[PDB]
Assembly symmetry: C3
Homo-oligomer: 188 residues x 3
Protein backbone atom coordinates (compact mmCIF):
# COMPACT_ATOMS: atom_id res chain seq x y z
CA UNK A 1 0.00 0.00 0.00
CA UNK A 2 1.05 3.61 -0.55
CA UNK A 3 1.14 5.93 2.42
CA UNK A 4 -2.00 7.69 1.13
CA UNK A 5 -3.75 4.32 1.06
CA UNK A 6 -2.62 3.56 4.61
CA UNK A 7 -3.81 7.02 5.71
CA UNK A 8 -7.23 6.44 4.28
CA UNK A 9 -7.43 2.93 5.76
CA UNK A 10 -6.86 4.03 9.38
CA UNK A 11 -3.39 2.43 9.35
CA UNK A 12 -0.19 4.01 10.64
CA UNK A 13 1.40 5.98 7.80
CA UNK A 14 4.54 8.05 7.22
CA UNK A 15 2.93 11.41 7.24
CA UNK A 16 6.24 13.32 7.48
CA UNK A 17 8.40 11.76 4.70
CA UNK A 18 6.07 10.50 1.99
CA UNK A 19 6.49 12.67 -1.11
CA UNK A 20 2.93 12.46 -2.57
CA UNK A 21 1.52 13.52 0.83
CA UNK A 22 4.12 16.26 1.26
CA UNK A 23 3.18 17.58 -2.21
CA UNK A 24 -0.58 17.47 -1.55
CA UNK A 25 -0.09 19.30 1.78
CA UNK A 26 1.93 21.94 -0.06
CA UNK A 27 -0.81 22.39 -2.70
CA UNK A 28 -3.49 22.96 -0.06
CA UNK A 29 -1.31 25.32 1.98
CA UNK A 30 -0.64 27.62 -0.93
CA UNK A 31 -4.34 27.67 -1.84
CA UNK A 32 -5.21 28.52 1.75
CA UNK A 33 -2.61 31.26 1.71
CA UNK A 34 -4.16 32.76 -1.40
CA UNK A 35 -7.68 32.50 0.02
CA UNK A 36 -6.57 34.07 3.29
CA UNK A 37 -5.19 37.06 1.47
CA UNK A 38 -8.20 37.57 -0.84
CA UNK A 39 -10.51 40.45 0.02
CA UNK A 40 -13.76 39.10 1.49
CA UNK A 41 -15.90 41.02 -1.04
CA UNK A 42 -14.08 39.33 -4.01
CA UNK A 43 -16.92 36.81 -4.14
CA UNK A 44 -16.03 35.07 -7.44
CA UNK A 45 -12.31 34.71 -6.72
CA UNK A 46 -13.06 33.28 -3.25
CA UNK A 47 -15.53 30.76 -4.71
CA UNK A 48 -12.89 29.71 -7.23
CA UNK A 49 -10.25 29.21 -4.57
CA UNK A 50 -12.61 27.29 -2.26
CA UNK A 51 -13.68 25.00 -5.07
CA UNK A 52 -10.02 24.45 -6.01
CA UNK A 53 -9.14 23.69 -2.40
CA UNK A 54 -11.90 21.16 -1.83
CA UNK A 55 -11.71 19.87 -5.42
CA UNK A 56 -15.47 20.15 -5.78
CA UNK A 57 -18.20 22.54 -6.80
CA UNK A 58 -19.50 23.87 -3.55
CA UNK A 59 -23.11 24.96 -2.94
CA UNK A 60 -23.35 27.81 -0.44
CA UNK A 61 -20.23 26.89 1.53
CA UNK A 62 -19.21 30.17 3.16
CA UNK A 63 -15.70 30.35 4.60
CA UNK A 64 -14.71 33.34 6.74
CA UNK A 65 -10.99 33.90 6.63
CA UNK A 66 -8.56 32.74 7.82
CA UNK A 67 -9.10 29.10 7.08
CA UNK A 68 -6.78 26.08 7.12
CA UNK A 69 -6.91 22.49 5.97
CA UNK A 70 -4.22 19.84 5.30
CA UNK A 71 -5.41 18.23 2.05
CA UNK A 72 -8.76 19.92 1.20
CA UNK A 73 -9.91 17.10 -1.04
CA UNK A 74 -10.50 15.02 2.09
CA UNK A 75 -13.20 17.42 3.38
CA UNK A 76 -16.59 16.30 2.01
CA UNK A 77 -19.13 19.08 2.23
CA UNK A 78 -22.86 19.33 1.96
CA UNK A 79 -24.72 22.47 0.95
CA UNK A 80 -25.26 25.48 3.20
CA UNK A 81 -22.21 25.07 5.44
CA UNK A 82 -21.21 28.29 7.26
CA UNK A 83 -17.63 28.27 8.58
CA UNK A 84 -16.72 31.34 10.76
CA UNK A 85 -13.23 32.77 11.25
CA UNK A 86 -10.08 30.78 12.03
CA UNK A 87 -11.25 27.23 11.63
CA UNK A 88 -8.96 24.31 10.86
CA UNK A 89 -10.13 21.13 9.11
CA UNK A 90 -7.17 18.74 9.75
CA UNK A 91 -8.33 16.22 7.20
CA UNK A 92 -5.82 13.37 6.88
CA UNK A 93 -8.77 11.38 8.05
CA UNK A 94 -11.77 12.33 6.00
CA UNK A 95 -13.96 15.07 7.45
CA UNK A 96 -17.57 14.67 6.25
CA UNK A 97 -19.90 17.63 6.83
CA UNK A 98 -23.61 17.45 6.11
CA UNK A 99 -26.06 20.04 4.89
CA UNK A 100 -27.10 23.07 6.88
CA UNK A 101 -24.18 23.17 9.32
CA UNK A 102 -23.17 26.27 11.33
CA UNK A 103 -19.53 26.18 12.48
CA UNK A 104 -18.47 28.88 14.91
CA UNK A 105 -15.15 30.70 14.98
CA UNK A 106 -11.92 29.09 16.15
CA UNK A 107 -13.13 25.55 15.75
CA UNK A 108 -10.67 22.77 15.12
CA UNK A 109 -11.59 19.39 13.63
CA UNK A 110 -8.59 17.14 14.26
CA UNK A 111 -8.26 13.75 12.60
CA UNK A 112 -4.52 13.09 13.41
CA UNK A 113 -3.36 10.72 16.08
CA UNK A 114 0.35 10.44 16.87
CA UNK A 115 1.92 7.44 18.67
CA UNK A 116 2.13 7.82 22.48
CA UNK A 117 5.68 6.33 22.41
CA UNK A 118 7.99 9.12 21.38
CA UNK A 119 10.34 6.84 19.46
CA UNK A 120 7.56 5.96 17.02
CA UNK A 121 6.16 9.45 17.04
CA UNK A 122 9.50 11.00 16.27
CA UNK A 123 9.77 8.86 13.11
CA UNK A 124 6.77 10.77 11.75
CA UNK A 125 4.04 8.11 11.91
CA UNK A 126 0.40 9.14 12.29
CA UNK A 127 -2.98 7.42 12.19
CA UNK A 128 -6.00 9.27 10.83
CA UNK A 129 -9.45 8.96 12.38
CA UNK A 130 -12.31 10.31 10.28
CA UNK A 131 -14.75 12.93 11.66
CA UNK A 132 -18.45 12.84 10.68
CA UNK A 133 -20.48 16.02 11.25
CA UNK A 134 -24.19 15.45 10.70
CA UNK A 135 -26.51 17.70 8.82
CA UNK A 136 -28.51 20.33 10.72
CA UNK A 137 -25.84 20.92 13.35
CA UNK A 138 -24.53 24.03 15.15
CA UNK A 139 -21.13 24.42 16.79
CA UNK A 140 -20.32 27.32 19.03
CA UNK A 141 -16.93 28.97 18.87
CA UNK A 142 -13.72 27.55 20.31
CA UNK A 143 -14.81 23.89 19.81
CA UNK A 144 -12.30 21.12 19.24
CA UNK A 145 -13.38 17.75 17.82
CA UNK A 146 -10.98 14.81 18.20
CA UNK A 147 -10.13 11.98 15.79
CA UNK A 148 -12.76 9.39 14.96
CA UNK A 149 -15.65 11.38 16.45
CA UNK A 150 -19.16 11.48 14.99
CA UNK A 151 -21.62 14.27 15.85
CA UNK A 152 -25.14 13.22 15.06
CA UNK A 153 -27.57 15.10 12.89
CA UNK A 154 -29.59 17.86 14.53
CA UNK A 155 -27.20 18.28 17.44
CA UNK A 156 -25.87 21.49 19.04
CA UNK A 157 -22.38 21.74 20.55
CA UNK A 158 -21.76 24.59 23.02
CA UNK A 159 -18.85 27.00 22.77
CA UNK A 160 -15.63 25.77 24.24
CA UNK A 161 -16.46 22.12 24.00
CA UNK A 162 -13.83 19.46 23.54
CA UNK A 163 -15.60 16.60 21.77
CA UNK A 164 -13.71 13.40 22.64
CA UNK A 165 -16.61 10.99 22.15
CA UNK A 166 -19.48 10.55 19.74
CA UNK A 167 -22.54 12.74 20.27
CA UNK A 168 -25.89 11.17 19.40
CA UNK A 169 -28.38 12.85 17.02
CA UNK A 170 -30.72 15.61 18.23
CA UNK A 171 -28.66 16.32 21.32
CA UNK A 172 -27.54 19.51 23.08
CA UNK A 173 -23.96 18.88 24.37
CA UNK A 174 -21.35 21.05 26.05
CA UNK A 175 -18.18 20.87 28.06
CA UNK A 176 -14.62 19.77 28.25
CA UNK A 177 -15.04 16.86 27.88
CA UNK A 178 -18.22 17.35 25.90
CA UNK A 179 -21.26 15.68 27.44
CA UNK A 180 -24.92 15.55 26.40
CA UNK A 181 -27.14 17.91 28.43
CA UNK A 182 -30.48 16.90 26.96
CA UNK A 183 -32.35 16.02 23.83
CA UNK A 184 -33.56 18.56 21.28
CA UNK A 185 -37.04 18.40 19.88
CA UNK A 186 -36.40 19.03 16.16
CA UNK A 187 -39.95 18.42 14.90
CA UNK A 188 -41.45 20.67 12.20
Amino acid sequence: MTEKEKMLAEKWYDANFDQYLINERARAKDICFELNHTRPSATNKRKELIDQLFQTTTDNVSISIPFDTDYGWNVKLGKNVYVNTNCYFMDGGQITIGDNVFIGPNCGFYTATHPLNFHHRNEGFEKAGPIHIGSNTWFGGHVAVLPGVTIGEGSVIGAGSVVTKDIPPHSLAVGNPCKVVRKIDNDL
Copy 2:
Protein backbone atom coordinates in the same frame (compact mmCIF):
# COMPACT_ATOMS: atom_id res chain seq x y z
CA MET B 1 -39.58 46.84 13.02
CA THR B 2 -36.56 46.44 10.77
CA GLU B 3 -34.29 43.47 11.31
CA LYS B 4 -31.64 45.80 12.79
CA GLU B 5 -34.23 47.03 15.28
CA LYS B 6 -35.18 43.46 16.18
CA MET B 7 -31.49 42.59 16.59
CA LEU B 8 -30.95 45.44 18.98
CA ALA B 9 -34.13 44.63 20.91
CA GLU B 10 -33.15 41.02 21.74
CA LYS B 11 -35.82 39.71 19.33
CA TRP B 12 -35.35 36.98 16.75
CA TYR B 13 -34.13 38.56 13.52
CA ASP B 14 -33.25 37.45 9.99
CA ALA B 15 -29.55 37.74 10.29
CA ASN B 16 -28.84 35.84 7.03
CA PHE B 17 -31.13 37.56 4.46
CA ASP B 18 -31.64 41.15 5.57
CA GLN B 19 -29.86 43.46 3.13
CA TYR B 20 -28.92 46.34 5.51
CA LEU B 21 -27.33 43.81 7.90
CA ILE B 22 -25.60 41.96 5.06
CA ASN B 23 -24.16 45.30 3.85
CA GLU B 24 -22.99 46.38 7.32
CA ARG B 25 -21.31 42.98 7.85
CA ALA B 26 -19.57 43.41 4.50
CA ARG B 27 -18.33 46.91 5.46
CA ALA B 28 -16.79 45.67 8.71
CA LYS B 29 -15.22 42.61 7.08
CA ASP B 30 -13.39 44.63 4.47
CA ILE B 31 -12.14 47.06 7.13
CA CYS B 32 -10.91 44.15 9.23
CA PHE B 33 -9.21 42.71 6.18
CA GLU B 34 -7.39 45.98 5.59
CA LEU B 35 -6.41 46.29 9.25
CA ASN B 36 -5.18 42.70 9.32
CA HIS B 37 -2.89 43.36 6.40
CA THR B 38 -1.49 46.68 7.71
CA ARG B 39 2.02 46.57 9.12
CA PRO B 40 1.89 46.86 12.92
CA SER B 41 4.32 49.82 12.96
CA ALA B 42 2.01 51.87 10.62
CA THR B 43 0.58 53.53 13.72
CA ASN B 44 -1.48 56.29 12.03
CA LYS B 45 -3.04 54.05 9.36
CA ARG B 46 -4.00 51.47 12.01
CA LYS B 47 -5.60 54.16 14.20
CA GLU B 48 -7.57 55.37 11.18
CA LEU B 49 -8.82 51.90 10.34
CA ILE B 50 -9.76 51.12 13.96
CA ASP B 51 -11.66 54.36 14.29
CA GLN B 52 -13.44 53.65 10.99
CA LEU B 53 -14.31 50.15 12.13
CA PHE B 54 -15.75 51.16 15.48
CA GLN B 55 -17.17 54.42 14.10
CA THR B 56 -15.66 56.36 16.98
CA THR B 57 -12.53 58.19 18.05
CA THR B 58 -10.72 55.70 20.20
CA ASP B 59 -8.48 56.61 23.15
CA ASN B 60 -5.62 54.15 23.59
CA VAL B 61 -7.45 51.13 22.16
CA SER B 62 -4.64 48.84 21.03
CA ILE B 63 -5.58 46.00 18.69
CA SER B 64 -3.02 43.29 17.90
CA ILE B 65 -3.74 41.69 14.58
CA PRO B 66 -5.59 39.71 13.45
CA PHE B 67 -8.87 41.04 14.70
CA ASP B 68 -12.49 40.35 13.73
CA THR B 69 -15.87 41.86 14.45
CA ASP B 70 -19.29 41.59 12.73
CA TYR B 71 -20.53 45.21 12.75
CA GLY B 72 -17.86 47.23 14.63
CA TRP B 73 -20.21 50.07 15.46
CA ASN B 74 -21.85 47.79 18.02
CA VAL B 75 -18.64 47.54 20.10
CA LYS B 76 -18.62 50.38 22.66
CA LEU B 77 -15.15 50.96 24.01
CA GLY B 78 -13.68 52.82 26.92
CA LYS B 79 -10.14 54.15 27.03
CA ASN B 80 -7.03 52.02 27.56
CA VAL B 81 -8.36 48.74 26.16
CA TYR B 82 -5.59 46.29 25.14
CA VAL B 83 -6.75 43.54 22.76
CA ASN B 84 -4.08 40.85 22.03
CA THR B 85 -3.88 38.70 18.89
CA ASN B 86 -6.78 36.86 17.24
CA CYS B 87 -9.75 38.16 19.15
CA TYR B 88 -13.29 38.19 17.81
CA PHE B 89 -15.97 40.64 18.98
CA MET B 90 -19.18 39.06 17.55
CA ASP B 91 -21.26 42.14 18.16
CA GLY B 92 -24.79 41.66 16.81
CA GLY B 93 -25.64 42.16 20.43
CA GLN B 94 -23.82 45.20 21.70
CA ILE B 95 -20.45 44.53 23.33
CA THR B 96 -19.67 47.23 25.91
CA ILE B 97 -16.09 47.38 27.20
CA GLY B 98 -15.05 49.67 30.02
CA ASP B 99 -11.83 51.52 30.70
CA ASN B 100 -8.55 49.85 31.52
CA VAL B 101 -9.35 46.39 30.16
CA PHE B 102 -6.68 43.78 29.26
CA ILE B 103 -7.95 41.17 26.78
CA GLY B 104 -5.66 38.21 26.15
CA PRO B 105 -5.05 36.47 22.83
CA ASN B 106 -7.61 34.20 21.18
CA CYS B 107 -10.55 35.52 23.12
CA GLY B 108 -14.01 35.33 21.64
CA PHE B 109 -16.95 37.47 22.80
CA TYR B 110 -20.04 35.86 21.29
CA THR B 111 -23.41 37.60 21.32
CA ALA B 112 -25.24 35.32 18.78
CA THR B 113 -27.77 32.72 19.76
CA HIS B 114 -29.24 30.42 17.11
CA PRO B 115 -32.52 28.48 17.57
CA LEU B 116 -32.09 24.96 19.00
CA ASN B 117 -34.68 23.64 16.47
CA PHE B 118 -32.86 23.20 13.21
CA HIS B 119 -35.86 24.15 11.08
CA HIS B 120 -35.86 27.66 12.57
CA ARG B 121 -32.10 27.83 12.66
CA ASN B 122 -31.79 26.86 9.03
CA GLU B 123 -34.01 29.81 8.05
CA GLY B 124 -31.26 32.11 9.34
CA PHE B 125 -32.85 33.49 12.51
CA GLU B 126 -30.65 34.63 15.40
CA LYS B 127 -31.15 36.41 18.72
CA ALA B 128 -28.44 38.72 20.03
CA GLY B 129 -27.53 38.90 23.72
CA PRO B 130 -25.38 41.86 24.73
CA ILE B 131 -22.05 41.38 26.57
CA HIS B 132 -20.93 43.90 29.23
CA ILE B 133 -17.24 43.90 30.19
CA GLY B 134 -16.56 46.08 33.21
CA SER B 135 -13.74 48.50 33.59
CA ASN B 136 -10.52 47.38 35.29
CA THR B 137 -10.76 43.79 34.08
CA TRP B 138 -8.20 41.24 32.83
CA PHE B 139 -8.91 38.24 30.62
CA GLY B 140 -6.36 35.54 30.05
CA GLY B 141 -5.95 34.00 26.63
CA HIS B 142 -8.30 31.48 25.05
CA VAL B 143 -11.40 32.84 26.88
CA ALA B 144 -14.87 32.58 25.40
CA VAL B 145 -17.73 34.72 26.71
CA LEU B 146 -21.29 33.69 25.80
CA PRO B 147 -24.33 35.79 24.88
CA GLY B 148 -25.92 38.01 27.51
CA VAL B 149 -23.03 37.71 29.97
CA THR B 150 -21.82 40.53 32.21
CA ILE B 151 -18.34 40.51 33.78
CA GLY B 152 -18.19 42.89 36.68
CA GLU B 153 -15.68 45.67 37.14
CA GLY B 154 -12.35 44.76 38.71
CA SER B 155 -12.64 41.07 37.90
CA VAL B 156 -10.00 38.67 36.50
CA ILE B 157 -10.88 35.77 34.20
CA GLY B 158 -8.30 32.95 33.92
CA ALA B 159 -7.01 31.60 30.62
CA GLY B 160 -9.19 29.03 28.99
CA SER B 161 -12.36 30.04 30.71
CA VAL B 162 -15.76 29.63 29.14
CA VAL B 163 -17.93 32.32 30.71
CA THR B 164 -21.54 31.10 30.54
CA LYS B 165 -22.86 33.10 33.49
CA ASP B 166 -22.41 36.56 34.93
CA ILE B 167 -19.31 37.16 37.03
CA PRO B 168 -19.70 39.60 39.92
CA PRO B 169 -17.37 42.62 40.39
CA HIS B 170 -13.95 42.23 42.03
CA SER B 171 -13.86 38.49 41.49
CA LEU B 172 -11.16 36.05 40.36
CA ALA B 173 -12.90 33.41 38.15
CA VAL B 174 -11.66 30.50 36.06
CA GLY B 175 -12.81 27.34 34.38
CA ASN B 176 -15.03 25.74 31.84
CA PRO B 177 -17.65 26.60 32.93
CA CYS B 178 -16.19 29.71 34.54
CA LYS B 179 -16.70 29.87 38.29
CA VAL B 180 -15.64 32.42 40.92
CA VAL B 181 -12.60 31.30 42.95
CA ARG B 182 -12.49 34.20 45.39
CA LYS B 183 -12.81 37.91 45.80
CA ILE B 184 -10.11 40.41 44.86
CA ASP B 185 -9.15 43.20 47.18
CA ASN B 186 -8.91 46.16 44.75
CA ASP B 187 -8.35 48.92 47.33
CA LEU B 188 -5.83 51.70 46.65
Copy 3:
Protein backbone atom coordinates in the same frame (compact mmCIF):
# COMPACT_ATOMS: atom_id res chain seq x y z
CA MET C 1 18.23 47.01 37.27
CA THR C 2 16.75 47.73 33.85
CA GLU C 3 13.23 46.61 33.13
CA LYS C 4 14.58 43.84 30.86
CA GLU C 5 16.71 42.62 33.77
CA LYS C 6 13.69 42.66 36.09
CA MET C 7 11.66 40.79 33.47
CA LEU C 8 14.25 38.08 33.21
CA ALA C 9 14.62 37.85 37.00
CA GLU C 10 10.93 37.12 37.69
CA LYS C 11 10.49 40.59 39.23
CA TRP C 12 7.66 43.01 38.52
CA TYR C 13 8.63 45.16 35.54
CA ASP C 14 7.16 48.05 33.55
CA ALA C 15 6.20 46.12 30.51
CA ASN C 16 4.06 48.94 29.04
CA PHE C 17 6.34 52.03 29.24
CA ASP C 18 9.94 50.83 29.05
CA GLN C 19 11.43 51.94 25.73
CA TYR C 20 13.92 49.07 25.12
CA LEU C 21 11.10 46.55 25.67
CA ILE C 22 8.67 48.54 23.52
CA ASN C 23 11.29 48.58 20.73
CA GLU C 24 12.04 44.85 20.99
CA ARG C 25 8.30 44.04 20.89
CA ALA C 26 8.00 46.21 17.78
CA ARG C 27 10.92 44.39 16.08
CA ALA C 28 9.36 40.97 16.67
CA LYS C 29 5.89 42.11 15.58
CA ASP C 30 7.09 43.37 12.23
CA ILE C 31 9.06 40.16 11.63
CA CYS C 32 5.99 38.11 12.48
CA PHE C 33 3.94 40.25 10.12
CA GLU C 34 6.40 39.58 7.31
CA LEU C 35 6.50 35.85 8.06
CA ASN C 36 2.71 35.69 8.19
CA HIS C 37 2.46 37.19 4.75
CA THR C 38 5.17 35.02 3.14
CA ARG C 39 3.95 32.23 0.88
CA PRO C 40 4.41 28.88 2.62
CA SER C 41 6.38 27.42 -0.31
CA ALA C 42 9.00 30.27 -0.09
CA THR C 43 11.16 27.94 1.99
CA ASN C 44 14.38 30.02 2.08
CA LYS C 45 12.70 33.34 2.87
CA ARG C 46 10.68 31.72 5.68
CA LYS C 47 13.83 30.15 7.16
CA GLU C 48 15.51 33.55 7.06
CA LEU C 49 12.63 35.27 8.81
CA ILE C 50 12.34 32.55 11.48
CA ASP C 51 16.04 32.70 12.20
CA GLN C 52 15.85 36.51 12.40
CA LEU C 53 12.88 36.29 14.75
CA PHE C 54 14.43 33.83 17.15
CA GLN C 55 17.93 35.28 16.69
CA THR C 56 19.37 31.82 16.13
CA THR C 57 20.08 29.28 13.43
CA THR C 58 17.21 26.88 13.68
CA ASP C 59 17.43 23.15 12.86
CA ASN C 60 14.17 21.80 11.44
CA VAL C 61 11.89 24.24 13.27
CA SER C 62 8.75 24.29 11.13
CA ILE C 63 6.30 27.13 11.75
CA SER C 64 2.87 27.03 10.10
CA ILE C 65 1.47 30.49 9.69
CA PRO C 66 0.19 32.55 11.35
CA PHE C 67 2.58 32.72 14.24
CA ASP C 68 3.10 35.25 17.03
CA THR C 69 5.68 35.92 19.70
CA ASP C 70 6.50 38.98 21.86
CA TYR C 71 10.32 39.08 21.77
CA GLY C 72 11.40 35.99 19.76
CA TRP C 73 14.90 35.94 21.20
CA ASN C 74 13.40 34.65 24.45
CA VAL C 75 12.17 31.42 22.80
CA LYS C 76 14.93 28.79 23.06
CA LEU C 77 14.37 25.99 20.59
CA GLY C 78 15.73 22.53 20.10
CA LYS C 79 15.82 20.72 16.78
CA ASN C 80 12.79 19.14 15.10
CA VAL C 81 10.09 21.36 16.59
CA TYR C 82 6.82 21.35 14.59
CA VAL C 83 4.53 24.31 15.34
CA ASN C 84 1.07 24.11 13.62
CA THR C 85 -1.13 27.08 12.71
CA ASN C 86 -1.96 30.04 14.96
CA CYS C 87 0.33 29.49 17.89
CA TYR C 88 1.48 32.23 20.23
CA PHE C 89 4.73 32.07 22.22
CA MET C 90 4.26 34.94 24.74
CA ASP C 91 7.88 34.95 25.79
CA GLY C 92 8.56 37.76 28.27
CA GLY C 93 9.44 34.85 30.47
CA GLN C 94 11.74 32.55 28.58
CA ILE C 95 10.05 29.70 26.72
CA THR C 96 12.44 26.73 26.39
CA ILE C 97 11.43 24.00 23.94
CA GLY C 98 13.35 20.75 23.63
CA ASP C 99 14.04 18.51 20.68
CA ASN C 100 11.40 16.54 18.84
CA VAL C 101 8.35 18.52 19.97
CA PHE C 102 4.97 18.47 18.16
CA ILE C 103 2.84 21.55 18.90
CA GLY C 104 -0.73 21.46 17.64
CA PRO C 105 -2.69 24.35 16.17
CA ASN C 106 -4.04 27.22 18.26
CA CYS C 107 -1.75 26.63 21.18
CA GLY C 108 -0.82 29.48 23.46
CA PHE C 109 2.21 29.48 25.77
CA TYR C 110 1.67 32.38 28.16
CA THR C 111 4.44 33.62 30.44
CA ALA C 112 2.80 36.97 31.53
CA THR C 113 1.23 37.51 34.90
CA HIS C 114 -0.54 40.80 35.65
CA PRO C 115 -1.25 42.06 39.19
CA LEU C 116 -4.66 41.03 40.59
CA ASN C 117 -5.14 44.58 42.02
CA PHE C 118 -6.27 46.73 39.15
CA HIS C 119 -4.46 49.83 40.40
CA HIS C 120 -1.10 48.07 39.97
CA ARG C 121 -2.19 46.33 36.82
CA ASN C 122 -3.34 49.53 35.22
CA GLU C 123 0.15 51.03 35.70
CA GLY C 124 1.44 48.40 33.27
CA PHE C 125 3.39 46.11 35.61
CA GLU C 126 3.83 42.44 34.73
CA LYS C 127 5.80 39.49 36.09
CA ALA C 128 7.13 36.84 33.70
CA GLY C 129 7.12 33.14 34.56
CA PRO C 130 9.23 30.94 32.30
CA ILE C 131 7.74 27.90 30.50
CA HIS C 132 9.84 24.73 29.99
CA ILE C 133 8.64 22.26 27.34
CA GLY C 134 10.59 19.01 27.47
CA SER C 135 11.94 17.14 24.53
CA ASN C 136 9.87 14.35 22.97
CA THR C 137 6.53 15.97 23.74
CA TRP C 138 3.22 16.26 21.84
CA PHE C 139 0.55 18.90 22.37
CA GLY C 140 -2.86 18.61 20.83
CA GLY C 141 -4.58 21.66 19.42
CA HIS C 142 -6.23 24.40 21.45
CA VAL C 143 -3.85 23.97 24.44
CA ALA C 144 -2.99 26.85 26.75
CA VAL C 145 0.04 26.68 29.06
CA LEU C 146 0.21 29.17 31.93
CA PRO C 147 3.17 31.08 33.39
CA GLY C 148 5.89 29.16 35.22
CA VAL C 149 4.74 25.74 34.02
CA THR C 150 7.08 22.88 33.14
CA ILE C 151 5.95 19.96 30.96
CA GLY C 152 8.25 17.01 31.40
CA GLU C 153 10.05 15.17 28.65
CA GLY C 154 8.14 12.43 26.86
CA SER C 155 4.73 13.72 27.90
CA VAL C 156 1.54 14.09 25.82
CA ILE C 157 -0.99 16.87 26.41
CA GLY C 158 -4.51 16.33 25.02
CA ALA C 159 -6.34 18.86 22.86
CA GLY C 160 -8.10 21.58 24.75
CA SER C 161 -6.02 21.32 27.86
CA VAL C 162 -5.33 24.26 30.11
CA VAL C 163 -2.01 23.50 31.79
CA THR C 164 -1.96 25.38 35.10
CA LYS C 165 0.47 23.09 36.92
CA ASP C 166 3.64 21.20 36.11
CA ILE C 167 3.25 17.89 34.29
CA PRO C 168 5.78 15.19 35.16
CA PRO C 169 7.86 13.39 32.49
CA HIS C 170 6.42 10.48 30.50
CA SER C 171 2.84 11.37 31.35
CA LEU C 172 -0.40 11.48 29.35
CA ALA C 173 -2.39 14.53 30.63
CA VAL C 174 -5.62 16.20 29.56
CA GLY C 175 -8.27 18.57 30.75
CA ASN C 176 -9.14 22.00 31.95
CA PRO C 177 -7.41 22.08 34.35
CA CYS C 178 -4.91 19.64 32.90
CA LYS C 179 -4.45 16.49 34.97
CA VAL C 180 -2.30 13.39 34.48
CA VAL C 181 -4.30 10.38 33.22
CA ARG C 182 -1.50 7.81 33.32
CA LYS C 183 2.11 7.13 32.62
CA ILE C 184 3.52 6.49 29.15
CA ASP C 185 5.92 3.67 28.53
CA ASN C 186 8.53 5.37 26.30
CA ASP C 187 11.04 2.49 26.14
CA LEU C 188 12.80 1.65 22.86
